[PDB]
Amino acid sequence: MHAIVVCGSKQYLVHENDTFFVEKLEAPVGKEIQLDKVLMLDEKIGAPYLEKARVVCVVEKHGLQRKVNVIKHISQKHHLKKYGHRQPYTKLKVVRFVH
């Protein structure tokens, strides 16, 4: 019903039919990815990581986050630098929890 997964470096608590956003995984939309690192599943929690506990997820989209403008400015020092960032993400929904 719920699991503690480790995608990228963050840990997500996921239920059945739950869509959460993670960092780009380099996978086409529509595939069936298998998240490996699982900490807690149901009631049996493994100490390092649970073994054979697999999280079946489907990738929904590969969009980008909102634009972030980084404007570094040193007051009265003739330094005005500007930069923009659009971090890519991927949205995926849980399908089935492998025993």
Partner: protein
């Protein structure tokens, strides 16, 4: 990106409490009163929704000050005029107005804020065993 945490949308589980300051130290009572009033001890703490319970203090004149603080430590209040600095000793405060002393002590343990006004409002302090606050059916807890 990640999953956002759950935050209460101005949800009020606030309840009424009763405490007896028969022989409690001023600072030791005030620290727990502020924690109880702010709701910091609550499992779910959203620090913009004043999710903290009311609290009533009984027997304010019965509190104690350790050491010689009853005659050597002074409480100060200055009006906006010149010379309007009124000083009262610990002993005079413990007799004449003891409720104000506990009130100021509890208020001092709160962050400078616009929510701290409501937080200090939820403290009903009485100098006697009687209180007009029995209509709320407040539960009883010890040393708090």
């Amino acid at each position: 990106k990640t999953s956002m945490l759950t935050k209460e949308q101005a949800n009020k589980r606030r309840q009424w409490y009763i405490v007896d300051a028969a022989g409690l130290v001023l600072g030791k009572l005030a620290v727990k009163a502020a924690d109880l009033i702010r709701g910091k001890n609550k499992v779910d703490f959203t620090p913009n929704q004043d999710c903290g319970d009311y609290l009533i203090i009984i027997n304010s004149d019965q509190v104690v000050l350790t050491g010689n603080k009853k005659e050597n430590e002074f409480w100060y209040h200055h009006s906006q005029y010149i010379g309007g600095i009124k000083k009262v000793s610990g002993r005079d405060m413990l007799k004449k107005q003891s409720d104000k002393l506990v009130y100021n002590a509890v208020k001092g343990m709160l962050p400078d804020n616009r929510l701290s006004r409501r937080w200090i409002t939820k403290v009903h302090v009485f100098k006697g065993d009687k209180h007009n606050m029995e209509a709320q059916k407040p539960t009883t807890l010890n040393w708090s």
